[PDB]
Ligand binder design. Sequence first.
Ligand SMILES: [Cl-]
Ligand SMILES: [Cl-]
Ligand SMILES: [Pt+2]
Ligand SMILES: [Pt+2]
Length: 129
Amino acid sequence: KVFGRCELAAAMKRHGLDNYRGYSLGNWVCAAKFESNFNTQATNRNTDGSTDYGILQINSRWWCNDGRTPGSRNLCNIPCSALLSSDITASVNCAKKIVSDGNGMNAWVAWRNRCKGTDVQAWIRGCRL
Ligand SMILES: [Cl-]
Ligand SMILES: [Cl-]
Ligand SMILES: [Pt+2]
Ligand SMILES: [Pt+2]
């Protein structure tokens, strides 16, 4: 599923991401934009052999089990395919653990390179929430 901007923002807010650990909602939406372009089915391969999955491109080295990532964890205790559902619950829950791990949203390199220090409020501009 490909979300709209405000559709995503609303789903994320409903799931408790708005100001989770101080990261306002626009941070999460901006991160989704530049990770998956709002597409729950996005997958990308990492140079280390791991794969990123879903709306927030959550990675198999640490976070989910895809069955094919040697010497890797499954810290969110989920199959990586659960991260491609049109329902974002598992991506959201897993991101809360990721962003609580010590590095915050810097764990998402696109957030750090493209959202951090920008006018992220623009990503929620005009949305009914
Ligand atoms: Cl959803
Ligand atoms: Cl949730
Ligand atoms: Pt939802
Ligand atoms: Pt939820």
